[PDB]
Write a protein that binds this ligand. Structure first.
Ligand SMILES: [Zn+2]
Ligand SMILES: [Zn+2]
Length: 221
């Protein structure tokens, strides 16, 4: 049943969803997802849990399964994605972020990743996990992560849930660019079976189309 800070859902033998929540004004309590990807005896995080207690609990759970936590990738500079870079860097767990993410962490006096992604596509786990930068949307720096073996697309905060009626926090968003960036993702992953949004329920490829329509409606206003 998890802890008060962390829950885990199994998506496949090699892929777990890590789940946390926080109250964020003005939307109230919102749930946040990242992933744990298992490759033999090595495990990898996609986003940190939203609390340091949850990240420590997640590391304990990984190690108690007989796995080594090898690396993490953070999908944008906000705290729901990148909040525990300092902890992971302190544990000598490699952290990966794009040059744009590290620009925005540095701008906000936050610790940068240990390892910088300097291309639009990046093999985060060889044959298992691929980073793609689609362009600006939720933030300038947002990336998605594709798991080709399971056809799971981790959308992060660039993808809204199907039931979302708005884009959520747009203080750092590029509403004009978001639909074009989303079309790149739609075109690249027509074979996506599961799309994991940064907040809310997992779903199918319709989450991409929904998010594109939310961004187009936000520009209309
Ligand atoms: Zn964000
Ligand atoms: Zn978010």
């Amino acid at each position: 049943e998890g802890t008060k800070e962390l829950k885990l859902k199994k998506l496949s033998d090699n892929v777990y969803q890590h789940i946390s929540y926080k109250r964020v004004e003005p939307w109230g309590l919102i749930g946040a997802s990242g992933l744990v990807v298992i490759n033999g005896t090595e495990a990898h995080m996609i986003d940190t849990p939203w609390t340091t207690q949850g990240t420590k609990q997640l590391i304990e759970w990984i190690e108690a399964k007989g796995l080594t936590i090898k690396s993490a990738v953070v999908t944008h500079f906000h705290e729901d994605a990148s909040g525990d870079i300092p902890l992971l860097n302190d544990l000598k767990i490699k952290t990966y972020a794009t040059s744009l993410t590290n620009k925005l962490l540095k701008l906000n006096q936050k610790e940068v990743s240990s390892d910088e992604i300097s291309s639009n596509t990046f093999e985060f786990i060889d044959g298992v996990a691929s980073v793609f930068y689609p362009g600006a949307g939720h933030t300038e720096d947002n990336i998605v992560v594709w798991l080709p073996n399971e056809k799971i697309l981790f959308g992060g905060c660039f993808v809204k849930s199907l039931k979302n009626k708005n884009l959520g926090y747009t203080g750092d968003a590029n509403i004009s660019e978001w639909p074009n960036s989303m079309q790149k993702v739609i075109n690249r992953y027509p074979d996506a079976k599961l799309v994991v949004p940064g907040h809310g329920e997992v779903g199918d490829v319709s989450l991409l189309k929904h998010t594109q329509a939310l961004a187009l409606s936000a520009a209309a206003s």
